[PDB]
Amino acid sequence: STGSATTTPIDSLDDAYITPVQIGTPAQTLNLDFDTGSSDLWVFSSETTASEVDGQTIYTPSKSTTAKLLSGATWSISYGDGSSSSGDVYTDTVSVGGLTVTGQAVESAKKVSSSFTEDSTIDGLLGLAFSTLNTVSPTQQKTFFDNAKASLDSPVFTADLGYHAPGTYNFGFIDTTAYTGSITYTAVSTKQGFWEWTSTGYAVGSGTFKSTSIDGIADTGTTLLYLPATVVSAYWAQVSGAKSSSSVGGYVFPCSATLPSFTFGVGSARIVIPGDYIDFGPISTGSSSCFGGIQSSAGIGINIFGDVALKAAFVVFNGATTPTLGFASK
Numbered sequence: 001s002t003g004s005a006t007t008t009p010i011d012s013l014d015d016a017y018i019t020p021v022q023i024g025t026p027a028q029t030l031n032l033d034f035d036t037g038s039s040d041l042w043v044f045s046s047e048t049t050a051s052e053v054d055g056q057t058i059y060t061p062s063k064s065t066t067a068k069l070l071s072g073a074t075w076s077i078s079y080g081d082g083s084s085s086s087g088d089v090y091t092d093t094v095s096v097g098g099l100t101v102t103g104q105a106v107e108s109a110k111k112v113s114s115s116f117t118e119d120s121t122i123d124g125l126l127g128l129a130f131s132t133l134n135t136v137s138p139t140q141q142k143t144f145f146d147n148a149k150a151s152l153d154s155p156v157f158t159a160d161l162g163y164h165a166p167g168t169y170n171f172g173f174i175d176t177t178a179y180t181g182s183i184t185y186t187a188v189s190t191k192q193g194f195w196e197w198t199s200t201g202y203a204v205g206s207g208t209f210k211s212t213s214i215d216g217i218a219d220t221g222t223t224l225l226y227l228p229a230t231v232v233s234a235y236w237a238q239v240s241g242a243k244s245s246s247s248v249g250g251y252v253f254p255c256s257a258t259l260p261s262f263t264f265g266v267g268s269a270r271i272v273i274p275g276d277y278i279d280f281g282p283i284s285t286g287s288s289s290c291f292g293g294i295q296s297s298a299g300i301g302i303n304i305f306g307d308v309a310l311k312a313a314f315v316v317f318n319g320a321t322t323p324t325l326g327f328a329s330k
């Protein structure tokens with residue numbers, strides 16, 4: 001079987017992408033943030049503290065004839081940005097773009113951090129990293145992808161994120177009309193539970209390509225591109241007036257500047273991020289200082305190929321017994 005769903009940016013800056021997901025019987029449709037950097041499927045629900053819900057669509061397990069409480073199970077997650085949530089666990093039927101899994105663990109939020117409350121357009125997350133990172137206790141639970149794997153025509157999913165436009169998540173098949181050229185595959189390490197891979201280098205604008213190994217994770221759940229300080233300094237040095245701002249928390253640039261492109265290597269192939277993808281607009285309303293889409297990973301401890309990089313490519317998440325990541329231009 002296969003599944004295919006449209007994913008849509010939540011605002012004009014592509015800060016995140018939401019994809020509709022059917023949960024329960026009869027279906028309750030929630031718009032979830034597909035996150036290859038985490039492994040919990042959690043949702044705003046009728047159990048969430050009422051003061052922490054502000055416009056989100058909630059899952060109501062008591063209205064689903066297929067929902068079953070998972071006795072004694074709980075979950076608690078903290079994300080790298082300091083966001084967090086926690087609650088109890090149901091099992092229920094979950095469908096994505098026609099692809100149905102029965103008995104999927106649906107983690108019902110009882111408490112969420114303020115960053116989720118203030119994001120009225122995100123009803124939850126659907127984790128797509130490896131199941132070893134799932135936070136359900138005492139019995140760890142599998143991801144949607146892991147549960148669907150056996151029934152998929154091919155054990156893959158693909159991410160085709162749009163620049164200021166809708167895109168597609170496909171499960172079980174590779175749409176050969178969605179990319180140009182060939183797909184270049186590269187090795188994945190699962191030792192940390194992430195889709196972790198090694199980029200072969202980078203170039204700034206039309207500059208010389210620098211061959212250097214950059215270990216990082218492919219993370220649809222993170223907005224920006226987080227790279228080592230040396231790389232990021234070389235990028236912003238080519239932008240007149242760009243500087244690192246401690247008060248703002250990263251590199252900013254005069255909004256009137258034109259940004260150079262950024263190229264990263266995948267084996268012998270090259271993915272080019274257009275300069276316009278790196279513009280994240282004024283730091284505050286009316287400001288002539290703009291926030292950069294490439295920032296240092298020095299404070300994070302890991303390099304992150306977030307949406308800024310992934311939306312420049314067609315990305316194959318190959319969940320075969322030896323997993324690999326595939327990148328193609330589009």
Ligand SMILES: NCc1ccc(C(F)(F)F)cc1
Nearest residue numbers: 037038079080219221222302
């Ligand atoms: N999108 C989930 C996520 C959040 C944080 C991290 C970090 F910062 F720990 F690498 C990775 C993945």
Ligand SMILES: NCc1ccc(C(F)(F)F)cc1
Nearest residue numbers: 079083115116119122221222
């Ligand atoms: N990396 C996971 C993640 C996804 C979304 C959010 C936000 F923006 F909704 F708070 C936080 C963390």
